[PDB]
């Protein structure tokens, strides 16, 4: 009880659906799996059942955990952000009751969305793993994710990962909509600069943000959050050395900051998308 | 308690 | 609970190694970034409000012996923040997920004692690209470090995570992502080498002039700061050798030492360092 | 804690192998460096004050059989310190990260009993460049040895870390950095060989003169000190054999032994030794 | 502790294979060295005092099937000392550095039972020149064997380490150094072959004379001792085939067997054996 | 383990049959002719091309032995865990020492023992070396065990292990009477109109086939009439000629040159 109820968060990180830039298919699927069953529950009767598993995958730094924070603000659910630190134990027969308790308190708190972040650290193909941790966790989890007809309120199992090809095929089966979150294109990048400068006084125009968004092809949303961080530092450099925001501040930051993803990681991501996604 | 050993 | 805090009570260091920002030679850029990520949030906390947030991760890399751990000692003296120095000996426990329960407890301590600094020395031994590693140590220590650094319900406010490494290309790309300013600490140039000789001789009586230190700094191209610390160590032994085979420090002592002592870093290691700097890195100047 | 010190209590050797500085032949330079790093700080501790610090790491390398472990026995007799003598059998363990709390509490033992000496015999088997090695043994024992030798909160005052190796080019560059005087122990020369015959015959009654030992030393070019120890062994077992085929020692006994006994070394191993000496090393004279 | 002695309790052999020195034909040099390293220290221990120490390592090498393991059985009968016939099955284990504690535990057992003999059969499977081998098995089993044979705090008094091999050129040079008398066991000559026929017929009723055995020994040039043991086996199995196929032994039985049985060795293997003997080796006569 | 398989059951090559009847039966039927210098044989390497009835002859010795029989093989001794592939060998010889007489049949010994000039350190030196030391060695006592072994590549075998196998017998492609016997056996008690001259005809027809191939032409010829039943009888010689036209063997006539090479040099 009082050991897994440190999975419920309660601070509600204030990210709203108009802060993720782009990703409209992903917002569409998440709305029709989270918002719509609660708002019109009469529709889901007969053969029409809601979705009970969604995997988000992609390269590192593109929006997965952030979009999970957006769900955590907008859902009006009870939200378990559980992880591998909170399920595994020394004593044998504790990594059975811990998963079992997790889903039973999820059905105490219907509607429930449960965010098992980075599922490849729980579920590791069981050919080399140790007895306690790998086998009884993954088998009990497979069982309890075989609740198809009974889980019509409550459990929607999200999940994010960066290595989607190292995932067990039974668990690739359980996640029934593997959506791919890619590096962002032009309108999204321009939107992210306009968001991340916030309400800071700047002389920039729409064609300036348009210029920077044209300049930054290859960057994920993390990188643009840190070029806006560094460019917002640029006034205090112009006070220590010993003002407005210019465009030379952003050009300064973009010269200094260098991209993060490597262009063969994208080949294996596109591989998995073409084979299963 | 079920302790971990380590192999070659 | 208290068993684990009894283990990690021996990590809050309490002695302040007296290295100051002038005992570091060279490195304008790395001192600059470290000052505006460590010193400046505490000294003027009213500035960092709104969109302007402090930096929450800094990776230092370079060839062996060029200043990384030493600059971390300079931060440890000048910061006025609690300075945790953790390592792989103190996280890998024997006991089924203590190596995740320990990590989570580490950052929980560094949130209850904010502002804090966590200095993970030689981070390439925890974080090894996870394509060949073993299940537990690999996926579970790397994964708890990832989720714990930014995650969902975790709030990395006011903690900073340093880290040094010599093999920056063997680092996992998610952890290359978490360290948001990869600064490169290079072999010293001419003015830096001359500065290091002038520092390391200290207040020892010597007949040397500015053109003598300038001469030696011209002589030693290829040496890191370790090597110049040991040629000053050996050259400071030269009066004892006189005073047994039978004073001042006089320039034949240093020429004697520089003839005997030979560089430590080769010249293809530098090619892969420059590779990583050109693909992902800053320039530490 | 105390389980691990209960394991490593059997490494602090205490029998003092009675080899004195006389009994080594040749190698004036290596004895000289070892004396001014081991004997002299204890005997005159007032000197080493200010910038003048003693040496804290010495690597001895060379071909097989030339004096490395023997010179370590000479230090173990003459030092008056707490000589440990550890090896790879005593640091690697079975249960998951026990193989580095051993490393840590080894060096913490040497700090509680300073001035200490740590003699890591054959260091290339612990420290293997970490580009192909396994996660636990490789990164964690090598990494804890690195951080523990200089590190941040660690204070290597008054401990000395020896180490011998035969493959000095297969050593990681951070650990090549930590060993700050790489001395090279070479195959012998004429005066050393003559000295080794005069030592190894001991107090055995022989008709030999100085020109006889001089003759044999001229005869044996290419032999290491092992080989001359076994030609003296065989030549001392010649008269017992003549007792069996039926006295003091003829020079024909030694010529007989030198004809029968054949050296160990070859002549491309020497090319890679000279390579490393020309790129990173000292000269052991 | 006792787990490991529970493993190595099955190495102290307890049956004394009754091979005596007379049975081993030829090879007087190898018997001579083995007697003066095994028999003579025990029988007259007053002699070995001062500088005169017994031999502590002997390597036997040769082509396959010439007498090495058999001569080790002769030592095992005639020695009157504790004999451990260890092998590669009894030293390698699965759990990360629990092989080394079996090596160290083997010599630490052997000095409880002094005088002792350790016979490592086919030492070329432990000790493989370390330029291509893997990290653990290579550096750690070879290194613990090195340090354990002479080392610093180790005291190889009263133990002897035998060892046989067929590939003596694939042996590491430090371990070529530790084995201080490399004796070469060759293919037998005429008198040895005649002796082996006379031994292997035993007390079986035969009409043969000395010139008959002399004839066969002249007939069989190129055969090792295995081959002559099997031509005597087949020639002794002729009469049973004359009971089924329907007595006394006449030379047509041996000519019959020698026509049917075909040799084992090949005349370039001998070139590399003679190579190693001419570069590093003794001569087993 | 004794199901049927007999000395009566096998076709051709009485040299192999008599060497083995000797080396197992002649000690077991008479343990009192082998005293003094006269000891039984303790290793026999059979080889040949595939299909020629090696392992079947081995299990004929299993039934026809009154002895224990351990039909381990090279598939079951490979591991990948640092010296596990040796304790398997050693405990195998422990249950063979404890249970005299015994027979150890290592099928396809060429997969353990690969001439050691290109192989890897551990598996090469350590499995080959433990097999050597374990077969004769010092403290080991190979009393009452017989180490068989079959192979198809006898020239890729290490010379120390060629030495340990002290009777390398060669199992060749068979003759006429054996093939006729194998057709008569494999048709069993199935109703057929065939005569002795019919089996004689087929045996004349099939030169080059091993015993596997004749077992599958009898398999196919027994499944011709059911095939004309359900996709729409008796057993004709045209059924067997039909099957022998369709079914093809494995072998090449240069493989035989290297087999004859090894037989002329060591066998
Ligand atoms: N769609 C987005 N909208 C706004 N900010 C974004 C977006 N994607 C990334 N970012 C920025 O990058 C940060 C890192 O996002 P994060 O959740 O860590 O990504 P992920 O989990 O895929 O790696 C976000 O918190 C934000 O700072
Ligand atoms: N840039 C430098 N300025 C001053 N001293 C230096 C510098 N680099 C190295 N040193 C000296 O060399 C030693 C090696 O520094 P250290 O922090 O251990 O280097 P690192 O951790 O990169 O290998 C320091 O203790 C100091 O004595
Ligand atoms: N320089 C030397 N002076 C005297 N004896 C020496 C010398 N070098 C080697 N020896 C002899 O060599 C023997 C074995 O050498 P050893 O100590 O094993 O050297 P190492 O460990 O480098 O191989 C020593 O026991 C000693 O008898
Ligand atoms: N010189 C010899 N004298 C007597 N018997 C011998 C001799 N050489 C070989 N043998 C026979 O060889 C067998 C021992 O094998 P061995 O020669 O030890 O092989 P290896 O020497 O390759 O280990 C015994 O059968 C023994 O009868
Ligand atoms: N020469 C033969 N005589 C009798 N039966 C044979 C012969 N060759 C093969 N067979 C039959 O074919 C089957 C397979 O033979 P097998 O011995 O496994 O082939 P291989 O010798 O290639 O391993 C056996 O059960 C055997 O009865
Ligand atoms: F895509 Be992130 F790195 F979770
Ligand atoms: F930390 Be150093 F560069 F070895
Ligand atoms: F030089 Be020795 F072999 F340690
Ligand atoms: Mg994330
Ligand atoms: Mg450092
Ligand atoms: Mg040594
Ligand atoms: Mg043998």
Residue numbers in the entry:
A (entry chain A): 116 to 357, 399 to 433
B (entry chain G): 165 to 172
C (entry chain B), D (entry chain C), E (entry chain D): 112 to 357, 399 to 437
F (entry chain E): 126 to 357, 399 to 433
Source paper text:
The peptide adopts an extended conformation that resembles a canonical β-strand (phi −92° to −151°; psi 102° to 189° (−171°)) and packs closely against Vps4 subunits A-E. Two distinct classes of side chain binding sites propagate along the pore. Class I pockets are formed by pore loop 1 residues K205 and W206, with substrate side chains sandwiched between W206 from successive subunits. The class II pockets are formed by the pore loop 1 M207 residues of successive subunits, and are flanked by pore loop 2 residues of the first Vps4 subunit and, to a greater extent, by the pore loop 2 residues of the preceding subunit. Nucleotides primarily contact one Vps4 subunit at a subunit interface, with the β-phosphate and BeFx contacting two ‘finger’ arginines, R288 and R289, from the following subunit.
The Endosomal Sorting Complexes Required for Transport (ESCRT) pathway drives multiple cellular membrane fission processes through the formation of filaments comprising different subsets of related ESCRT-III family members. ESCRT-III filaments stabilize highly curved membrane necks that resolve by fission when the filaments are remodeled by Vps4. Vps4 is monomeric or dimeric at cytoplasmic concentrations, but forms a hexamer when active and recruited to ESCRT-III filaments. The Vps4 N-terminal MIT domain is followed by an ~40 residue flexible linker and an ATPase cassette that comprises a large ATPase domain, small ATPase domain, and a β domain.
